[PDB]
Amino acid sequence: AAPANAVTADDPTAIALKYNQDATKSERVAAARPGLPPEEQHCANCQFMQANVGEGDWKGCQLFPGKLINVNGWCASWTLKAG
């Protein structure tokens, strides 16, 4: 069950970025974002995931202020967690 402030499928930014709370139901292979092979990409290893926001599998994303993403999700702004 998603938190009340989870990013949802009719959020206009979710649509533009092709966000899905489940990376296995995403277009990460088509996007081929750099940094890791696409099958290895999800929010937990993305630079914009905020691990001090949320709880459990539902964490912050800098690009979605006031909301929570799922650590197992993905979107086209995926960027390797480098620091």
Q: Which residues bind ligand SF4 (CB under 6 A)?
A: 19, 43, 46, 48-49, 61, 63, 69, 73-75, 77-78
Query: Binding site annotation covers 61?
Result: yes
Complex with ligand SF4: residue 38 or 77, whichever CB lies closer: 77
Query: Binding site annotation covers 3?
Result: no
Q: Are 4 and 48 in contact (CB under 8 A)?
A: no
Instruction: State in angstroms the smallest separation of the CB of 66 from ligand SF4.
Output: 13
Query: Binding site annotation covers 55?
Result: no
Half-sphere exposure of 36 (CA within 13 A, CB side): 17
Q: What is the largest CA-CA distance in the chain?
A: 32
Instruction: State in angstroms the smallest separation of the CB of 53 from ligand SF4.
Output: 11
Q: Are 7 and 61 in contact (CB under 8 A)?
A: yes
Neighbour tally for 14: CB within 10 Å: 20
Give the residue ranges of the annotated binding site for [4Fe-4S] cluster: 43, 46, 61, 75
